[PDB]
Paper text:
Although we could not obtain good diffraction data of the Ups1–Mdm35 complex with POPA suitable for high-resolution structure determination, we successfully determined the crystal structure of the Ups1–Mdm35 complex with DLPA at 3.20 Å resolution by the molecular replacement method with the Ups1–Mdm35 apo-complex as a search model. The crystallographic asymmetric unit contained eight Ups1–Mdm35 molecules, and two of the eight Ups1–Mdm35 molecules contained a DLPA molecule in the pocket while clear electron density was not observed in the pocket of the remaining six Ups1–Mdm35 molecules. Structural comparison of the Ups1–Mdm35 complexes with and without a bound PA molecule shows the r.m.s. differences of 1.2 and 0.6 Å for 169 Cα atoms of Ups1 and 73 Cα atoms of Mdm35, respectively, indicating that no significant conformational change occurs in Ups1–Mdm35 on PA binding. Interestingly, some of the Ups1–Mdm35 molecules without clear electron density of DLPA in the crystallographic asymmetric unit had the Ω1 lid swung away from the pocket. The bound DLPA molecule is completely enclosed in the pocket of Ups1, with the phosphate head positioned at the bottom of the pocket and the acyl-chain tails oriented toward the entrance of the pocket, yet leaving some empty space in the pocket. At the bottom of the pocket, the positively charged side chains of Arg25 and Lys58 are close to the negatively charged phosphate group of DLPA, and side chains of Tyr26, His33 and Lys58 are within the distance that allows formation of hydrogen bonds with the phosphate oxygen atoms. The hydrophobic acyl-chain tails are in contact with hydrophobic side chains of Thr76, Ile78, Met104 and Val106 in the pocket. Besides, we found that the Ω1 lid could take an alternative open conformation that provides a wide space rendering the pocket entrance accessible to PA. Since the size of the entrance of the pocket is about 9 Å in diameter, which is too narrow to allow two acyl tails of PA to pass through freely, PA binding to the pocket may require opening of the entrance as well as a swing of the Ω1 lid away from the pocket entrance. The closed Ω1 lid may be important for preventing the bound PA molecules from slipping off the pocket, as well.
Recently, Ups1, a yeast member of the conserved mitochondrial intermembrane space (IMS) proteins, was shown to mediate PA transfer between the mitochondrial OM and IM in cooperation with Mdm35. Mdm35, another conserved yeast IMS protein, is a binding partner of Ups proteins, and facilitate their import into mitochondria. Surprisingly, two distinct polypeptides of Ups1 and Mdm35 form a single compact domain, the Ups1 part of which corresponds to the START (StAR-related lipid-transfer) domain, likely functioning as a lipid-binding domain. Like other START domain-containing proteins, the Ups1–Mdm35 complex contains a deep pocket that can accommodate a lipid molecule and an Ω-loop likely functioning as a lid for the pocket.
Numbering used by the authors:
A (entry chain A), B (entry chain M): 4 to 76
C (entry chain B): 0 to 159
D (entry chain N): 3 to 61, 72 to 169
The structure:
Amino acid sequence: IMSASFAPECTDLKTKYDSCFNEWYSEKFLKGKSVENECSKQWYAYTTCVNAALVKQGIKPALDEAREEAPFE
Amino acid sequence: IMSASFAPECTDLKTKYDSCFNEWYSEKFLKGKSVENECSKQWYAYTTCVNAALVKQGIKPALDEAREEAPFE
Amino acid sequence: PMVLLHKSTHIFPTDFASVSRAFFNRYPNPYSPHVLSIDTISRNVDQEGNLRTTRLLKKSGKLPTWVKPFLRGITETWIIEVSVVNPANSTMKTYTRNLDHTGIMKVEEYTTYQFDSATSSTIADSRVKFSSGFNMGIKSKVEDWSRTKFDENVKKSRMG
Amino acid sequence: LLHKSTHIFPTDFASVSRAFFNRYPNPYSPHVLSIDTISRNVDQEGNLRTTRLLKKSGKGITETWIIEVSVVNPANSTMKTYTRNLDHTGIMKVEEYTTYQFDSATSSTIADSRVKFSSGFNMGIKSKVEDWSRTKFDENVKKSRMGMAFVIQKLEE
Ligand SMILES: CCCCCCCCCCCC(=O)OC[C@H](COP(=O)([O-])O)OC(=O)CCCCCCCCCCC
């Protein structure tokens, strides 16, 4: 099986965002070849799917806050 | 009012022993006049009474154990 | 509050590229049945040039009944996993701790990945820190009582 | 652990020391229900060795047994005293070292008091939650690490 998103309705748009990333990670970002997010599409799909579901999630406020902190002081 | 013994039936035996001791302690022992039990009769009558009452006290084992220890090391 | 640091090291027989990737795609795997979902909340490349990534994960667990009554109905935690990847010096930092339940306790996990130019290895440095929802108060509050209650008992008994 | 208090009795040694042996009963310690002398003798050094048993009330269970032990040195005007509850030590053990020593230049008896509190059942805890973390930590660091190994291996096949 693959990695589930917390929103079962995004598990897929997720998988794809992931795939193009691994490609852009290993083959481009890691080798200095990076250039203009070769995945606007896949990300946006997934990232807007997950954001929709997140607002209904009580954990969101806690997550936002945690995103403000810098654990790497 | 004199201090009682944990065992009511010895309070009097203790009163008599203590009185004897206080005299022996202040007038003899502290003035370097005696290092012996000049209260033997009161002490033995009293201590016989107490030990008899301790054999029936749940705290005996703990007491026996504590008597073997040397706090001042 | 109360804290308990734990460190431990591990060396991987592969490069930074190989290991880092596995980090990002570590789920699912033989010993992760408790990991339910992982999402990539946000990713990007800073002014510095490193990959900045925040991922929300949700792991499950079975509370020990004999110490679980008090706590309501809870069989799972939300976790945040922030990370940084420096493509230059081939190193990646990975902070990661719980988001909900910080009330009872709060676990934190700093793990770093350094590639050892020489040994073809990627060294991973894990530091875990437990803390507590609680504890700030009493004992100290209390102690002091023991301090004064005796500061009084000695002085009180003294007089007599 | 500790409690360092000091007091001075503008009295001599024979007075302060006799008092200690006859401190009970008194209005400041109504909780003291009884005190008994378990053993008393003069060791080979000429010092009065005593060990007494007191029962103290306070707030089924309710009371505590305290052991008292003392050593009186008539040669240098010193008196060492020790007290510690006999029961309930698992929960909290309270130890008290108080020494009375006569000072000639001030004609007063100085009392030094040290009080140690020590709980074993407490510490037993401090130790389990400690082990619990080392365990939960150790176990999981092993797993996660082997997760990464697998994920890495297959990703190479
Ligand atoms: C009162 C209860 C509070 C529980 C709070 C738990 C907070 C954990 C925060 C830190 C999690 C984390 O980043 O640690 C990394 C490891 C990674 O191991 P794995 O998940 O890859 O096997 O993750 C783990 O293996 C550790 C967590 C595994 C158990 C998760 C239990 C979730 C809570 C269940 C009770 C509510």
